[PDB]
């Protein structure tokens, strides 16, 4: 690989004290498949191969960075790239613990 930095990492917000639920369904269509969590507002929406609700959320909010609940990758919609950075480690780890632990 991912980009080791991107100019949208500044928009990554603190993780809610409720933590993450990697089984959370899409907030629009309720699908349990291929969801992502927004790293600005922590809403959960489905991927491009389901109903494209996270891409819609990007369009209507401008929020840049999203975390996959399938493989814990982080995608930036502006840079059109995967990103990994020390600034993403806390949220990936919280997600990894919820998913696997």
Ligand X SMILES: O=C(O)CCc1nc2cc(Cl)ccc2s1
Q: How far is the CB of 26 from Zn ion (least distance, A)?
A: 3
Residues near Zn ion, by CB under 5 A: 6, 8, 26, 28-29, 38, 40-41, 46, 51, 53, 61, 63, 76, 78-79
Residues near ligand X, by CB under 6 A: 36, 47-48, 54-55, 66, 75
Beta bridge partners of 82: 75
Q: How far is the CB of 86 from ligand X (least distance, A)?
A: 21
The interface partner of residue 36, options being Zn ion, ligand X, none and the CB cut-off 5 to 8 Å by kind, is ligand X
Contacts 24+ apart (CB under 8 A), 68-71: 68/34, 68/36, 69/22, 69/23, 69/24, 69/34, 69/35, 69/36, 69/37, 69/44, 69/95, 69/99, 70/34
């Amino acid at each position: 690989s991912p980009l080791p930095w991107c100019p949208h990492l500044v928009a990554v917000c603190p993780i809610p004290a409720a933590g993450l639920d990697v089984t959370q369904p899409c907030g629009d269509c309720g699908t349990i498949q291929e969801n992502w969590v927004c790293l600005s507002c922590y809403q959960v929406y489905c991927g491009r191969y389901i109903n494209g609700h996270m891409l819609q959320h990007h369009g209507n909010s401008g929020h840049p960075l999203v975390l996959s609940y399938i493989d814990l990758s982080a995608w930036c919609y502006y840079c059109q790239a995967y990103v990994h950075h020390q600034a993403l480690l806390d949220v990936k780890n919280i997600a990894h613990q919820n998913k696997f632990g």
